[PDB]
Amino acid sequence: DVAGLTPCGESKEFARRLDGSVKKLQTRLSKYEAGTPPALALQKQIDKTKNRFDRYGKAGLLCGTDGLPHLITDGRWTHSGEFVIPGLLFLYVAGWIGWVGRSYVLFARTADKPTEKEIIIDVPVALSFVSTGFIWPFSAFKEFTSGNLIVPADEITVSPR
């Protein structure tokens, strides 16, 4: 397929991975009686292993010669669920955390003791801030264009050089 890789559903090495993984659990299960708690524990682990291998086979993942799934991250849309979409989810969460933390440090600067607000957090105000982060892309870009995100170079302390 892509880069000489094989879809995991038809890779023979993927099938040998699934079979070896199940034989390893079945030989541990061969040492216990049917209704015992170790037998139920290992039978639930064999069900989990088979479910994982089945899900991977039908997902469009590509396996290598080693029978392990490989991730394609060049930007193609048939594989966006391996990096591009997890990456979009991450950047939404990370920008939320950054926007909310920045809003609280700017609030804490206008406090009676700004450094006490950072070791003893004003929890109602900080929760007001954590709720605001869901629209951080729009709030932060409007913050940027209205000249309130970036401070000019001449209000920043620098080394003498």
């Binding site: 139920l40 524990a41 682990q45 109602p124 709720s131 605001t132 709030s139």
Partner: protein, 194 residues
């Protein structure tokens, strides 16, 4: 001094009785932490969603848009049954409506910043049912109570659908006591997993 709702507890602060349905029921003291306007807007919006949601589940079983996709009796089943693209379109429509109605006042910090902004007051009154001040208080009172009742009803209807895989009306029509053998509460820790 003592709340009407709960006599042994002292009356919650920030509750002056001005809002309809103000009964002094805030035992946890949440009102002190979170501004009442945000809480009331949340309560009204949550209730309005629930009012439509309860009515919708019963209506979905009784009436189906023509076609197999819209024919699922059980609303939870209807969630899977409906065309996904249309459901995502509804999600976008809800977002855009939220964006315009609030006038970009979406965040807790920036909502209610304008002095005229009032909890729940999105200025939605096309037929002007509430325009007369005489009926304003009773309409407000009924809306708040309907919303609370609807939230309780929806929680019950969803969970009853979960316990017995039946649509709501048919459970009323044909009633099965939960066997309780299935779906025992929790137990993940007790049996050490698996």
């Amino acid at each position: 001094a003592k709340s009407k709702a709960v006599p042994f507890l002292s009356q919650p602060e920030a509750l002056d009785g001005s809002m309809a349905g103000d009964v002094g029921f805030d035992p946890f003291g949440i009102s002190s932490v979170i501004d009442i306007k945000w809480l009331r807007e949340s309560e009204l919006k949550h209730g309005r969603i629930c009012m439509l949601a309860a009515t919708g589940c019963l209506v979905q079983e009784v009436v189906h848009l023509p076609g197999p996709a819209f024919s699922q009796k059980m609303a939870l089943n209807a969630w899977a049954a409906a065309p996904r693209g249309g459901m995502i379109s509804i999600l976008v429509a809800i977002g855009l409506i939220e964006m315009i109605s609030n006038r970009f006042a979406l965040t807790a910090t920036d909502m209610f910043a304008n002095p005229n902004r009032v909890p729940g007051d999105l200025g939605f009154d096309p037929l002007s049912l509430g325009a007369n001040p005489a009926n304003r208080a009773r309409f407000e009172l009924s809306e708040v109570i309907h919303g609370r009742a609807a939230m309780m009803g929806f929680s019950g209807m969803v969970h009853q659908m979960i316990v017995s895989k039946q649509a709501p009306i048919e459970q009323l029509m044909h009633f099965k006591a939960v066997d309780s053998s299935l779906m025992k509460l929790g137990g993940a820790a007790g049996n050490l997993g698996y």
